[PDB]
Design a protein around this ligand. Structure first.
Ligand code: ATP
Ligand code: ATP
Ligand code: ADP
Ligand code: ADP
Ligand code: MG
Ligand code: MG
Ligand code: MG
Ligand code: MG
Lengths: 34, 536, 213, 316
């Protein structure tokens, strides 16, 4: 009636440019370079 | 050469008493080669030992010795593991924790070569993680991985020469065999109960500060305490002294509903014998010693001498005790007490055991095995005898053998595992030169003789019933009951006949005949005696 | 500011003299004399008896009788997780404050109390003769290794309440860890009188109890 | 001498030999140190360190113990009080055992031989199998007694016996002792009752030749021959040997004289009252009546011995 269990975790490929810096790319492309 | 030993360390400072031989052996085998000049050691070409193990009954001074030896060496500080403190849930993180202990030594060896300092590692409660490599089936498997990592790191392809591992355990039989070969853990020691000199030294050590400040009254004598307490471990002695001090301090303090202290008594504070005796009587109770409650529940109403057959049993018991105490070629003797029922044969065994002055006395009775199966009874008996094997002398009483076997006239039926565990335990001699004595009681000798259980026992004693009327009269006079004319009439009606009654039944007939009015006690007593006395 | 008359307990007027003679007697005497004596204070108590007779009450009252910090509470089987090596973390988390205070100061820290309920639930006998019980062994070892170990504590005290004194591991009930044990049995007449007085005093105060009773 | 160490060490592995050498070195070195209140090492006697043979024997007997096979402690445990010679029936058993052990080493038609020692109880059978096993000087010797299996169920006993027998198939030639058969397979006259699994395991293991070119010798002991004959087990053992009891006053006198008790006048006193009849008593009981007798006063000793001997009087 007992079974101890182990776990395995995974990391996340955190991306600086997947949101809020695509808007910053636009602010760098459409605004700064314009 | 900067001596591995701390520049100032004397055995008097350590504070351990009664462990001289063991410490000398440990120092000789695990420290000798690090204090000798190095050139000769280099010529001889030897590798230092890298393991020590300690085991024994709880509370005898293992963790004290380990801590003191760790403090002796003036080289870094010990790295402690507090049990199963190296364990996690993520896959592959216990092994990392195990590997982080040896890292510093690995790094230091390369930088310094052959001039490194000893690195110590203490493994308190080793038997929580290191077990038989495959005796835990059903778990996630961390045990096997941990054992393999430890084995591969202590003595692997790469070689270390500046480590020392110490282990402590109470059960030195579950630990893995592959971890106890002459390469990894060589020196294995047992810490056992001290003898008289050990107790004397321990009591000298503990009650030393009080002597310094004249807080100990001259009335106390250490030799009396040393002789009076038998089979006490160190922790029990410490508890005794602490209890005495606590009682002495509480004497002066006044009031409990409002805490108050009087300086007049506080200034003049001293501990006397009375506190020690009270603490000995009431508070502290050993585990491998003798207890005063076992002899107050079995021998209830003392022992009276109703006749001649009473003294013979005691004399023969004394003779057997003397034989077992002062001889060799005979370290295990047993005796069987048998007779008709209700005869008083379970009190005489207790009295004989108590009159022996053996340090360790134990009574195994079926009162404490109600509802147990066969295996439970076997385990209980084995544990009792295993404990009995741990003293210089002993005495074990087996009570009402016919109830242990679970006999019953119909069939017949009984247990077989119990019978065999009992038949093979009456011939196993104790280890080394340690004595033993076994006293068994029963009420049906013929059935036992038919089981071939009369070969194991070395002798037999017969406990008879009250037979001659004079013995009955003597018992009645001694018990303090009907006297004067009443006694006379009883005699008139009893001398001219034969009587056959046990001693445990008279105490009930007497008490049953005392609830009538003070005019028919004698008549009722005689009627009951006639109705009971079926002389066979 | 505290007196027994305000404790609220009635009947256990003798089984409280000992617990205030072996467990607290060495914390009220002038410190200098005790230091000169060089003794070590007790660090354990075990109470047992029939169920529903005034055990937890003594726990709360002794806990709040001292200036000690507010008691912690481990609620028996609240320290059993499912992942490997999670019970031991729960057990170890109890002594963190005690260890930190002992390391920071020395011979000055305030008493820390740990009220342990249903000790029999987990602290079962370790056993021997091959075979592993399971997780109970690891918890028992991790508990035995902290009260008494290579590192010394002198500012702790543990209280254990249960009604089966013969199912607890023997290695735990030795002088040095859970030494003092007490039995709290059924009360005789005077106990009942005091209990009834204590429980009806409030009503008697406001003239709400008739004189016929 | 290296050869003496090579011969003495039995069932040692390389780590064991290294540990023995290291322990001898440490013991030899420890003499110079003086572990007084302060650690001191002598610098004058030093540089003259010499390892002596006595150190090697001390290390052998105190600080190194192998873990494959039996060791001297078990032998000293079973054959406890020596082997005296109370007459001719003592040499015959040893001679027969010697002939058997000689057979089981220089022949190939019969790579398995079994023998059985039988006699009355309390007669000294478990202390004559040990001597025969010891005197053979075989490489691997193991004793399978039932006092190491207290409380075991049937399966556990079967597994233990199987493991002990498997440990003997990985050597060149070995001897195994099964003492007190009647107790391995539980037996009790009422019923009768016993274990069947153990009996079947033994009856199959007694006729299982080992791998090619290896030999074995099994010595078994028992006290109740007829029951074994009735289980159809006594036609599996190759031969049989009988171990008798003291059955004549002259042998009793010889045993008393050699043991070293009741000397001078008391011996003649016993001879007067012993030569007029026959006796029937095993050699283990005779070592207990003597100790029971030697507890009274300096006088009143021969009387008790003769009384106890008279009470313990029976015959076939
Ligand atoms: N001389 C005596 N010898 C033995 N017991 C005595 C003697 N005088 C008084 N007694 C009392 O008699 C009782 C002895 O018998 P006990 O009560 O031990 O039962 P028992 O003999 O073991 O009985 P059972 O055979 O029924 O188990 C005890 O109360 C003992 O105090
Ligand atoms: N000539 C002898 N032969 C055998 N044993 C002897 C002899 N002389 C002395 N002894 C002693 O006799 C004892 C051997 O008897 P042992 O206890 O082995 O009897 P047993 O027949 O195996 O007993 P049981 O069947 O009751 O277990 C040992 O103490 C041994 O020292
Ligand atoms: N040989 C000894 N000399 C002095 N005191 C001892 C000795 N053995 C035990 N003691 C005392 O008893 C206690 C033993 O407890 P300890 O050894 O720490 O626990 P354990 O036996 O489980 O390792 C210590 O507090 C110590 O004061
Ligand atoms: N000695 C006592 N004096 C007064 N009340 C008591 C006493 N013992 C028990 N009680 C009453 O019992 C109630 C509950 O007791 P409880 O703490 O549950 O005991 P337990 O934990 O042993 O069951 C309390 O409300 C209290 O009033
Ligand atoms: Mg410890
Ligand atoms: Mg009885
Ligand atoms: Mg409660
Ligand atoms: Mg035998």
């Amino acid at each position: 009636i007992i079974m101890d269990s182990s776990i395995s975790k995974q990391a996340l490929s955190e991306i600086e440019t997947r949101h809020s810096e695509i808007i910053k790319l636009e602010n760098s492309i459409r605004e700064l370079h314009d | 050469r900067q001596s591995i030993i701390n520049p100032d360390w004397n055995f008097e400072k350590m504070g351990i008493g009664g462990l001289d031989k063991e410490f000398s052996d440990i120092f000789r085998r695990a420290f000798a080669s690090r204090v000798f000049p190095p050139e000769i050691v280099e010529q001889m070409g030897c590798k230092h030992v890298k393991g020590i193990l300690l085991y024994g009954p709880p509370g005898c001074g293992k963790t004290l010795l380990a801590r003191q030896i760790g403090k002796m060496l003036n080289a870094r500080e010990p790295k402690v593991v507090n049990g199963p403190e190296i364990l996690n849930k993520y896959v592959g993180e216990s092994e990392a924790n195990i590997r982080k202990l040896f890292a510093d030594a690995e790094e230091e060896q390369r930088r310094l070569g052959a001039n490194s300092g000893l690195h110590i590692i203490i493994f308190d409660e080793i038997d929580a993680i290191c077990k038989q490599r495959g005796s835990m089936a059903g778990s996630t498997g961390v045990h096997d991985t941990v054992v393999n990592q430890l084995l591969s790191k202590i003595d692997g392809v790469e070689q270390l020469n500046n480590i020392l591992v110490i282990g402590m355990t109470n059960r030195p039989d579950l630990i893995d065999e592959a971890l106890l070969r002459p390469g990894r853990l060589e020196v294995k020691m047992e810490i056992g109960l001290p003898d008289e000199k050990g107790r004397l030294q321990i009591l000298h050590i503990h009650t030393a500060r009080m002597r310094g400040h004249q807080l100990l009254s001259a009335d106390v004598d250490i030799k009396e305490l040393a002789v009076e307490t038998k089979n006490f471990s160190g922790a029990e002695l410490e508890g005794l002294v602490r209890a005495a001090q606590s009682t002495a301090m509480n004497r002066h303090i006044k009031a409990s509903t409002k805490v108050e202290v009087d300086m007049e008594k506080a200034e003049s504070l001293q501990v006397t014998r009375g506190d020690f005796l009270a603490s000995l009587e009431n508070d502290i109770k050993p585990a491998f010693g003798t207890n005063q409650e076992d002899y107050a529940s079995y021998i209830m109403n003392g022992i009276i001498k109703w006749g001649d057959p009473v003294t013979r049993v005691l004399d023969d018991g004394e003779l057997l005790v003397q034989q077992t105490k002062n001889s060799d070629r005979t370290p295990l003797v047993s005796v069987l007490l048998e007779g008709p029922p209700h005869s008083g044969k379970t009190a005489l065994a207790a009295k004989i055991a108590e009159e022996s002055n053996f340090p360790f006395i134990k009574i195994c009775s079926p009162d404490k095995m109600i509802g147990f199966s066969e295996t439970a009874k076997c385990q209980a008996m084995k544990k009792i005898f295993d404990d009995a094997y741990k003293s210089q002398l002993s005495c074990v009483v087996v009570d009402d053998i016919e109830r242990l076997l679970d006999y019953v006239p119909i069939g017949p039926r009984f247990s077989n595992l119990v019978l065999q565990a009992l038949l093979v335990l009456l011939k196993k001699a104790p280890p080394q030169g340690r004595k033993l004595l076994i006293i068994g009681t029963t009420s049906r000798k013929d059935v036992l003789q038919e089981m071939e259980m009369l070969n194991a026992f070395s002798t037999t004693i017969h406990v008879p019933n009250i037979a001659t009327g004079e013995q009955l009269l003597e018992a009645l006079e001694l018990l303090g009951n009907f006297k004067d004319k009443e006694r006379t009439t009883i005699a008139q009606q009893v001398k001219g006949k034969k009587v056959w009654i046990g001693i445990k039944k008279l105490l009930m007939l007497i008490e049953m005949s005392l609830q009538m009015d003070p005019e028919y006690r004698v008549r009722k007593f005689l009627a009951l005696l006639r109705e009971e006395g079926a002389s066979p």
